[PDB]
Design a protein around this ligand. Sequence first.
Ligand SMILES: [K+]
Ligand SMILES: [Mg+2]
Ligand SMILES: [Mg+2]
Ligand SMILES: [Mg+2]
Ligand SMILES: [Mg+2]
Ligand SMILES: [Mg+2]
Ligand SMILES: [Mg+2]
Ligand SMILES: [Mg+2]
Ligand SMILES: [Mg+2]
Ligand SMILES: [Mg+2]
Ligand SMILES: [Mg+2]
Lengths: 149, 130, 213, 86, 25, 98
Amino acid sequence: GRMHSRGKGISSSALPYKRTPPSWVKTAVADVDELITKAAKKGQMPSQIGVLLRDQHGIPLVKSVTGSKILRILKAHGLAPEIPEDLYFLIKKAVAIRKHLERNRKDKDSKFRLILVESRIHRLARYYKRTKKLPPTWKYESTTASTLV
Amino acid sequence: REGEHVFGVAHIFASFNDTFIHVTDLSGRETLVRITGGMKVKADRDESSPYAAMLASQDVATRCKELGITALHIKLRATGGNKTKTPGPGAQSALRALARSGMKIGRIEDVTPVPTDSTRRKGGRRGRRL
Amino acid sequence: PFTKKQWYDIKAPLLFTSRNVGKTLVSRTQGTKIASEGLKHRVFEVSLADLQNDEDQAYRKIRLRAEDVQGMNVLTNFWGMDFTTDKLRSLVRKWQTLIEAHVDVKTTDNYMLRMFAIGFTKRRPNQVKRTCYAQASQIRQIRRKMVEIMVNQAASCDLKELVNKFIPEVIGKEIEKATSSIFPLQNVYVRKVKILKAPKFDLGKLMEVHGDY
Amino acid sequence: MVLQNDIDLLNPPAELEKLKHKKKRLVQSPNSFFMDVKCQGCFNITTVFSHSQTVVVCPGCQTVLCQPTGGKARLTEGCSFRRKGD
Amino acid sequence: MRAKWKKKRMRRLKRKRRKMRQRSK
Amino acid sequence: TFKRRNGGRNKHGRGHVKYIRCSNCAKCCPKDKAIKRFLVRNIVEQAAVRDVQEACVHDGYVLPKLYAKVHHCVSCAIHAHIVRVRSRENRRNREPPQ
RNA sequence: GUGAAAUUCUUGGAUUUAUGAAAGACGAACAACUGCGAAAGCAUUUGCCAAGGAUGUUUUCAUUAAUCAAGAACGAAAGUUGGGGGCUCGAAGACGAUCAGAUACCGUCCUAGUCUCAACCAUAAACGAUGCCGACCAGGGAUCGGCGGAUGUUGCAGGACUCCGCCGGCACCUUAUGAGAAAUCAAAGUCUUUGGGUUCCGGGGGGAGUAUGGUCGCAAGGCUGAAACUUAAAGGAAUUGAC
Ligand SMILES: [K+]
Ligand SMILES: [Mg+2]
Ligand SMILES: [Mg+2]
Ligand SMILES: [Mg+2]
Ligand SMILES: [Mg+2]
Ligand SMILES: [Mg+2]
Ligand SMILES: [Mg+2]
Ligand SMILES: [Mg+2]
Ligand SMILES: [Mg+2]
Ligand SMILES: [Mg+2]
Ligand SMILES: [Mg+2]
């Protein structure tokens, strides 16, 4: 189930068996590449770039049309963010929780959620260190974390 | 005049110990006759008995004719508040005698004071053990 | 009850149908107990069935206020409108949703008053569900609709029209049919009205709503 | 419906899997599709996702097509819907 | 004998022993 | 030995429930455990309604009802015959009488 | 007020009736084999602040995971240190009553407390007396949240209602072909045909959660925790009598 809850929900996506892009997709790889690069220039991120491609531009799956994942495309183009998206959003949420909890010292339920989110942040940072996706000297400092985001 | 009814208000207050028959003006700031069940009995246990309320109701009926009170609004109530809320044993007889003793009855209402959420009831957490 | 005291007769406002409302007492003149000051009882509970000679509205209660004693009469005025315990206890049923709203609207005459509305969800003609509940996110919208309709029909001319829309169900029906987009909302009307503050006697505006006595 | 002893798991009925959960089917398949929404006027070729999440527009008047909801995007009454497929 | 009151008696004995030991250090 | 599957109360999916006080002894009992009844009766009974009918000023006055939800602890409910002791097989019968 | 009485209040007006102001506590009915939360726990309206499950997804990363010594957050009620508040109720105490006796059960008046703020405590029948994660194995209907479809009514696409289906949750009913000492359990099943992973923890009954040492706490106390000696039974479930 959930790592930090008792839920057992299974809602997710189901990729089609057909790996080839659908026939009606008449967009070349160059157009998709330019769109992804422009979005990454506009401060977007892979998760919220894939949805924009899926909805507005009718691209069901980037890995099908271009043959490679969004993060790989950005890294090859060199536009990839310095911090992975999931860790960035976890750090942002922890910063917001700390900012709220600063003025509410008796809100002893957001302190527990803060402990949970910090544990998740540390686990993800350890994983990214093991695979050399972060500098080995990286460290999550709570006081200066808000400056990062 | 005759036929047309002059109205008083009977604030019957029937607890488990006494029974008050109190006739007032429509405002309630006056008082015509106020007699309890304990006036008509010589033992302070029988005050709540139906017969004591019967006697007290007879007396209120006798008093309320000379001033022209030809009909009553009955406002029956019990202890209310945080204590018991059901009317006492003498609540009915006191009403019934009013009907029997040539007295007209207007609207009948229940005005037991109910709290939306009261203070702590006495007796403790384990309750009154017998 | 004494050989003293005077038998005065109350006068309900002209807005109702029958003005004669029982009889009252007061000390005649003894010492400092002035009859004029002593008759400022200022509260009379009536059923509104007598004031309209119709029996189906017996569930209501009208609180009249004695304003000026003159000509052996008392010349009352509106001071509140509440419910009997019978109707309120009959309405609240299990397997149902109770929605209560209240507002502190103000009239042009500076009569600060508080209004309360009460409503209940209604089962459909073809309903197999045995509960007929509502989600809190819906009862909140119902409460907002109640409040806005209250402040819409109020915030207008003098209280004369306000009680002209109280003895009938104008606020209640309007709330009923302005919320059918959310829930059916059966049995909707004003539970009670509390007068928070009166401007002043004003010395004469009371006679504009009274007959010749 | 004694049990699966009568049906064949290899070749199950073609309509019973139209109702099971997408993950729990014999082979996982999406429940969505892509549709080319046609407006009342011209510019009728815009392609949108069934379970869309962004409020798409049109070049002409921005002609708001769909609202994202908990499920299928709420297409307007004025916009006509036809679907494209593989 | 109720075990609650046995526990209470044990607590009284413990505090009395502590006082006696503090008397002589 | 577990006499009842639900433990004598009606608690599932929660940890705490505020109590009430028995109407006879004022003993604190959990709200779901307490024996709750809803009694609705005429203010005046059949022997009285006849004498109050003609005594009423107008014939259109309907006689008023009274409604009361009462709660009883297990001891008071059993002693007052609100609920009796049932057999082992009839204990599971949750169907109300009639 | 009581089974019955008295202690107490009262012609200086007790109890009762109507109006109004203030104070503190409490949120009836609606309220459910219903909801949320890691548990403790949470029930008037409205605004703000951050958080969360489930559902939907042809979005993204790609093993990042499960359980966990040491080490940490939170933890009813009572209790402790001060400030405020102090309605009701009420340990201690006093009095009345009952009684062979009543430091109790029953009445009345009440102190700490009950409410709140800043700190301590770390225990409950903290219970589902049932650790967490994963797979499989009977049926049924109801219900809560989300979603998909059909449907034909609403003083009104959508909302309310009806029917079918999927995921997630709290439960419930019938039945073993299962298990069990049995009560009973759809998990407490898939166990001599014994092995999915992992943490904690028990070894006849007392002495005893006691002595002592260590350690946390202002204290009350908490965590860890024996031995000598004594004993043939203690105990669980069900059965027939007796009461
Ligand atoms: K019960
Ligand atoms: Mg709904
Ligand atoms: Mg037993
Ligand atoms: Mg839960
Ligand atoms: Mg508990
Ligand atoms: Mg409430
Ligand atoms: Mg609920
Ligand atoms: Mg530990
Ligand atoms: Mg323990
Ligand atoms: Mg549903
Ligand atoms: Mg042993």
